[PDB]
Amino acid sequence: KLCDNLRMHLSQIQRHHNQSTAINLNNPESQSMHLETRLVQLDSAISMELWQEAFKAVEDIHGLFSLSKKPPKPQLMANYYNKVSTVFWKSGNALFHASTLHRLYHLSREMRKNLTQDEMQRMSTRVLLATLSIPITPERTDIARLLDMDGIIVEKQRRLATLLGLQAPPTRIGLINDMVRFNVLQYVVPEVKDLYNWLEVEFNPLKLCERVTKVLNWVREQPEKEPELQQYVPQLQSNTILRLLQQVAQIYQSIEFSRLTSLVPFVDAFQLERAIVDAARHCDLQVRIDHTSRTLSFGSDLNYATREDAPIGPHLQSMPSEQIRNQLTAMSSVLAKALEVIKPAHILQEKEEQHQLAVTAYLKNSRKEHQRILARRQTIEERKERLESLNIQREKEELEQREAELQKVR
Amino acid sequence: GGSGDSAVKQVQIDGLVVLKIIKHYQEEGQGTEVVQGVLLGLVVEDRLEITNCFPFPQHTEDDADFDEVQYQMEMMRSLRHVNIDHLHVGWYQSTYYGSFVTRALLDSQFSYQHAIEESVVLIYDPIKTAQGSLSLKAYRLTPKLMEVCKEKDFSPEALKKANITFEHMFEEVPIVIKNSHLINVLMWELEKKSAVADKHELLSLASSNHLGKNLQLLMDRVDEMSQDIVKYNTYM
Amino acid sequence: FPGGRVVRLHPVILASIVDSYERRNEGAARVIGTLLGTVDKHSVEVTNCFSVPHNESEDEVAVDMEFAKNMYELHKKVSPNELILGWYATGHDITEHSVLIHEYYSREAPNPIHLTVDTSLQNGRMSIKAYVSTSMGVPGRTMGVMFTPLTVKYAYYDTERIGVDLIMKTCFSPNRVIGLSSDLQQVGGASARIQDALSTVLQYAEDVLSGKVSADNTVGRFLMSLVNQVPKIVPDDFETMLNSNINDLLMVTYLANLTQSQIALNEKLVNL
Amino acid sequence: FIDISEEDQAAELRAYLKSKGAEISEENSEGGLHVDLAQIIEACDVCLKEDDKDVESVMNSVVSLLLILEPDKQEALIESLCEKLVKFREGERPSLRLQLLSNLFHGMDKNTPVRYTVYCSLIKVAASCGAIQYIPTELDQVRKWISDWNLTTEKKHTLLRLLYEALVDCKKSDAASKVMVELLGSYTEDNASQARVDAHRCIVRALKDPNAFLFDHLLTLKPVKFLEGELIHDLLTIFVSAKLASYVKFYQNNKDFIDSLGLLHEQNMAKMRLLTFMGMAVENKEISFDTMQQELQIGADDVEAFVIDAVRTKMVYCKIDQTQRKVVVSHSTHRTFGKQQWQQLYDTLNAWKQNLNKVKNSLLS
Incomplete structure (x- = not known):
């Protein structure tokens, strides 16, 4: 079906085989070829679990969005972005879904001027889904790559990002900052307004559970509250506990797990010590859990390596502790010892005024010589094209002299 | 004198060129190969003085791709018509590898150096920044290969060229040894940027501290050396 | 608060002005060009610049804006971040002749940015003096000279900051x-x-x-x-x-x- | 309006624009010019007659701003036209008038009624979005020249008072206040009628703000040495409690005056930071867990959450080990002579780190 409906699309888009109706102006036909089969293609494909055919059916529209470029946008554009989010979640990721909610937000902010509405319930619902569903998963881990050669596989991030209109995929907590730049933190529903004040603003490595437990478990009540939300929050809760564990790898050196159980409540205590192993095996941190005395060790430095932090930006808050690496002492010895002379000193203002006098003396001496440089460089620079063009062209003309001298001996 | 083999003298690159090189970011992506600009200069006191460069652009949507020479022709007139010259004595790139003179750069250089012999190729140590020595590299092509220049042979006919035994560890010239004479207005910036306020020096110095503490610098260089070099070793 | 107040300049503007003022561009001590970059609503983010065919005299000015279309078309392809912003000149801040350059730039739509690079020996001159017009209403004789002065905050994008310091070390002492x-x-x-x-x-x-x-x-x-x-x-x-x-x-x-x-x-x- | 590439016939050029303004400014245009090519008589009209918000007048005001200060007084005619900005009560367009007349251009500063008058205007007319913009350039020009006429330093202390009052923001108010108070013991307003009554308001800021530490911005430089604490100011009564580790001290040292300003609740906070810092300063590196709990006289996992508040404060900052090293050496609170003797140590300590190590480094390379 799909390959034949695609074959029909390919027979008409730019072929101009006959007088057949052009895609470029005849909107009743053109929007039937863009939308009206393909909405049902995508719905049928994902309902029948045909994920590759469903992605080929988002490429079926994108292969028009790259070619049918001279007409206006199709009518009621919002009907693309609100639907495609549920196929792009399973075929892509929850992150690309939340970035699709950003694209939907920045479009539908204006498009409600033609899609006329006065409903209050949609305003807070649009934003609450678009900010909360971001932090959910960076770790689409390289286990699909590491067992064989590197390749040019950057294509596989680029293709997904291209359908959202980017050369590279979505990028960390800045995706929430780009929303909170606007009135979003006041359009969002009163039960969740303060959530990111606890998750990222207040620097609380092991005192956040008392705040988040009410707001998260209350948004986990699904029957009146957009059931897809409660397919992000259950792991946002454990991801917030991992935000504690990842900040605490930078704030604790050791702990008896019987104390950590009182600091960080979880669904099951044995599964919290599993979650610490699991995150460390996933390279979110590196810690001695599973230990003999049931004391977790994070280490003060040890053989410190980037497995102990997130290198993609910081998912933990911006409080790393001190650790050693190449030139850490050396470059601090250059700058910090000089800054404790350049910032406070009584002395350096006299030295740097004497250096200003040397700079002034160099210019006072050498701007007399500008009178001797000027007329010479002016005549040389006027003549440089007239002179050097007689030299730079000679490897064009000497070919015939080389050939004639060779032909003479032959 | 201080000449190498053939008529071509040592190069010098004026700081005004180095700033016009550095205005271009590293951020194309992870990495792809592009010739970022031509180097323009003239035979002067001890050296070929590179006075100025204009950046030569290419398409950069995912891969690199070429475009019409309407750019270079109109832009080399744009440099000429203020006061009169067009003087392409080399070209430059700032690609991710470090400093690395690849087989394609040798082929592109072979076409360039056989056409104009008063020329050099430039590479710069990127925001990759291992930074021990030599932030700017010169390299000329040997005259001994240019005497046997059209193209190389997909056949044993290269054996008559191989028996010349031409250099492949060949000499690289020292770019900077003495003052470029246009030091003088940027010398007068330094007092204004230093003596009266802390506002404008420290933001150039703050980079060193975080070149040490931040993620895996020598570790990622030795990691790429564990990938680049073993692939070349296995190939030979 | 009404508009532009500060310029966030950096080294390659000054290097391109100096590489236009030295060398030459028809005028001896008086040389001119069109600055390029962008603005952010109270700051100017000047990114790079190039000189243009010019001649200022005590009764004449020539701005071939058609070349600043060509150079702008070219530099747009170099990077998308540039916009035609205004103009730059050497030697002196106030003259009647400088009112002609504002008319030639008023043939383009946007807010103008007049930069003067004042190459005195003295420390009592800041190297580049930055100005913008006020009372730009509806046409009198030509254009006004009641300019608003601008402060500087420097500190544009990263990699250039090491480039100028290597040159400043080289200005003090030449090294390999x-x-x-x-x-x-x-x-x-x-x-x-x-x-x-x-x-x-x-x-x-x-x-x-x-x-x-x-x-x-x-x-x-x-x-x-x-x-x-x-x-x-x-x-x-x-x-x-x-x-x-x-x-x-x-x-x-x-x-x-x-x-x-x-x-x-x-x-x-x-x-x- | 018409642009200035007309001849600089200053009074007539300004007056020609009053005819496009109000009729009461036009009959004093004609009557102002026909009497004389006048000074003060032409130069004051738009400053007194209405010029009101239903029309724009920034263009002709800017022509007045350059053409009054040259042919007559600068210092008096800059005070004129600023009264009417404060009277209309609009922040956008008066700021264009006040921004065009920037410092050290179109003439000279004249040491310094213009910047005083213009900063006084921008503070009084508009919100913080305007009023903040001159603070760096004016505190720089205060350092480039502090006013030799003493009354003008009282006036720029008064502008810093209008600054900390126009600011609703506590830490910018404490910044603008402690900047005035740093100058207040140096040079002018140091009299008992001025500095010594402001000492009370400094005690209000120092007691009520938990971000003040306790006494550290009073000990770091002159203000406690100039403003007495064993006077009935009671400044050093903070230095007493800040060493002495209890709510008992302040509660017993008290008065109904400072209690009525809110002091009853915040006195609990001093005990935390002083014991958390000073116990680690006495032990010197690695304190044990029950010591912190029994100095602070509180729970165990409460002290975990208070080590987090100490880490948010950067009173301590590194990784914390769980039986020993419960707080860690990132020292930032007052230890007056213990920090001076460790600075007296430091040059001798550094003497090897600067000679001995460089004798290996510079030798090797």
């Missing part, structure tokens, strides 16, 4: 690029030596009789923070861990010479 991290090393302990000079003067101000108001708890915070960075805290477990890290780094630096040796040995047998 193979030594650059050894130069960062031997000016490293020099900072600790001039620190030993200043720390002496700050102790010595209490040693003699009275003084030290310039230091006390701010210098105390600087030094406590300094020793909480470099070196770290002082167990001997740190000394052994520091030694094991140097023995690992040395074993890696050794392995880099082992690989230089094997880069040689395979390169050598194929050459026989």
Whole structure:
């Protein structure tokens, strides 16, 4: 079906085989070829679990969005972005879904001027889904790559990002900052307004559970509250506990797990010590859990390596502790010892005024010589094209002299 | 004198060129190969003085791709018509590898150096920044290969060229040894940027501290050396 | 608050003005060009610039804006971040002749940015003086000269900041690029030596009789923070861990010479 | 309006624009010019007659701003036209008038009624979005020249008072206040009628703000040495409690005056930071867990959450080990002579780190 409906699309888009109706102006036909089969293609494909055919059916529209470029946008554009989010979640990721909610937000902010509405319930619902569903998963881990050669596989991030209109995929907590730049933190529903004040603003490595437990478990009540939300929050809760564990790898050196159980409540205590192993095996941190005395060790430095932090930006808050690496002492010895002379000193203002006098003396001496440089460089620079063009062209003309001298001996 | 083999003298690159090189970011992506600009200069006191460069652009949507020479022709007139010259004595790139003179750069250089012999190729140590020595590299092509220049042979006919035994560890010239004479207005910036306020020096110095503490610098260089070099070793 | 107030200049603007003023561009002491970059609503973010066919005289001005279309078309392809912003000139800030350059720039739509690079010997001149017009209503005789002066905040995008400092070090003393991290090393302990000079003067101000108001708890915070960075805290477990890290780094630096040796040995047998 | 590439016939050029303004400014245009090519008589009209918000007048005001200060007084005629900005009560367009007349251009500063008058205007007319913009350039020009006429330093202390009052923001108010108070013991307003009554308001800021530490911005420089604490100011009564580790001290040292300003609740906070810092200063590196709990006289996992508040404060900052090293050496609070003797240590300590190590470094390379 799909390959034949695609074959029909390919027979008409730019072929101009006959007088057949052009895609470029005849909107009743053109929007039937863009939308009206393909909405049902995508719905049928994902309902029948045909994920590759469903992605080929988002490429079926994108292969028009790259070619049918001279007409206006199709009518009621919002009907693309609100639907495609549920196929792009399973075929892509929850992150690309939340970035699709950003694209939907920045479009539908204006498009409600033609899609006329006065409903209050949609305003807070649009934003609450678009900010909360971001932090959910960076770790689409390289286990699909590491067992064989590197390749040019950057294509596989680029293709997904291209359908959202980017050369590279979505990028960390800045995706929430780009929303909170606007009135979003006041359009969002009163039960969740303060959530990111606890998750990222207040620097609380092991005192956040008392705040988040009410707001998260209350948004986990699904029957009146957009059931897809409660397919992000259950792991946002454990991801917030991992935000504690990842900040605490930078704030604790050791702990008896019987104390950590009182600091960080979880669904099951044995599964919290599993979650610490699991995150460390996933390279979110590196810690001695599973230990003999049931004391977790994070280490003060040890053989410190980037497995102990997130290198993609910081998912933990911006409080790393001190650790050693190449030139850490050396470059601090250059700058910090000089800054404790350049910032406070009584002395350096006299030295740097004497250096200003040397700079002034160099210019006072050498701007007399500008009178001797000027007329010479002016005549040389006027003549440089007239002179050097007689030299730079000679490897064009000497070919015939080389050939004639060779032909003479032959 | 201080000449190498053939008529071509040592190069010098004026700081005004180095700033016009550095205005271009590293951020194309992870990495792809592009010739970022031509180097323009003239035979002067001890050296070929590179006075100025204009950046030569290419398409950069995912891969690199070429475009019409309407750019270079109109832009080399744009440099000429203020006061009169067009003087392409080399070209430059700032690609991710470090400093690395690849087989394609040798082929592109072979076409360039056989056409104009008063020329050099430039590479710069990127925001990759291992930074021990030599932030700017010169390299000329040997005259001994240019005497046997059209193209190389997909056949044993290269054996008559191989028996010349031409250099492949060949000499690289020292770019900077003495003052470029246009030091003088940027010398007068330094007092204004230093003596009266802390506002404008420290933001150039703050980079060193975080070149040490931040993620895996020598570790990622030795990691790429564990990938680049073993692939070349296995190939030979 | 109404508009533009500050310019966030940087080195390549000044390098391109100086590379237009030296060399030459028809005019001797008076040289002109069109600055390029962008703005952010109270700041100007000047990114790069180029000179244009020009001639100013005590009764004449020539701005061939058609070349600043060509150069703009070209520089747009170089990077999308540039916009035609205004103009720059050398030598003097106020003249009647400079009102003509504003008319030639008023043939383009946007807010103008007049920069004067005032190359005096004296320290009483800031190197570049930045201006924008006010009372730009509806046409009188030509255009107004009641310009609003602009401050500077510098600090545009990253990689250029090392480029100007390498040149500023070269302006003080010419040196060869193979030594650059050894130069960062031997000016490293020099900072600790001039620190030993200043720390002496700050102790010595209490040693003699009275003084030290310039230091006390701010210098105390600087030094406590300094020793909480470099070196770290002082167990001997740190000394052994520091030694094991140097023995690992040395074993890696050794392995880099082992690989230089094997880069040689395979390169050598194929050459026989 | 018409642009100035007309001849600089200053009074007539300004007056020609009053005819496009109000009729009461036009009959004093004609009557102002026909009497004389006048000074003060032409130069004051738009400053007194209405010029009101239903029309724009920034263009002709800017022509007045350059053409009054040259042919007559600068210092008096800059005070004129600023009264009417404060009277109309609009922040956008008066700021264009006040921004065009920037410092050290179109003439000279004249040491310094213009910047005083213009900063006084921008503070009084508009919100913080305007009023903040001159603070760096004016505190720089205060350092480039502090006013030799003493009354003008009282006036720029008064502008810093209008600054800390126009600011609703506590830490910018404490910044603008402690900047005035740093100058207040140096040079002018140091009289008992001025500095010594402001000492009370400094005690209000120092007691009520938990971000003040306790006494650290009073000990770091002159203000406690100039403003007495064993006077009935009670400044050093903070230095008493800040060493002495209890709510008992302040509660017993008290008065109904400072209690009525809110002091009853915040006195609990001093005990935390002073014991958390000073116990680690006495032990010197690695304190044990029950010591912190029994100095602070509180729970165990509460002290975990208070080590987090100490880490948010950067009173301590590194990784914390769980039986020993419960707080860690990132010292930032007052230890007056213990920090001075460790600075007296430091040059001798540094003497090897700067000679001995450089004798290996510079030798090797």
